[PDB]
Amino acid sequence: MLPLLFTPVTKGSGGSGGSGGSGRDLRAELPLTLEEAFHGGERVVEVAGRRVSVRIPPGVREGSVIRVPGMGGQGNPPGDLLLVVRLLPH
Fold first, then answer.
1. What is the signed CA dihedral for 33, 38, 41, 42, rounded to 10 degrees?
2. To 5 degrees, how large is the angle CA 61–CA 82–CA 58?
């Protein structure tokens, strides 16, 4: 379940007087090599079949989560993005 970038979370926990589900939080584990983490360029990730490039920070490490507000939940309400950098053995 859930590819890279993309993570189909729901939001209906609560109640006021309508749909309380603005902004889907897509948390995907980002497999990132040591050279990739060192240089901090872009990494091409496949979100629901869409080829996009996400910019990774230079000197990023294992367990570092890249929070990008608005780029996550696609569609009508822009949601939060969480890419938890998982360093590949090199």
1. 20
2. 35
Per DSSP, the residues of 4-45 read: SS----------SSS----S--EEEEEEE-HHHHHHT-EEEE
Which residues, other chains included, contact 75 with Cβ-Cβ below 8 Å and sequence gap of 6+? 24
Q: Which helix (H) or strand (E) holds 47?
A: strand 42-47
- Answer whether 65's CB lies under 8 Å from 84's CB: yes
CB atoms within 10 A of CB 73: 22
Can you tell me whether residue 66 is helix, strand or coil? strand
Method: NMR
Question: Counting every residue, how long is the chain?
Answer: 90
Going from N- to C-terminal start, the domains of the chain cover 1-90
Backbone angles phi, psi at 46, to 5 degrees: -105, 105
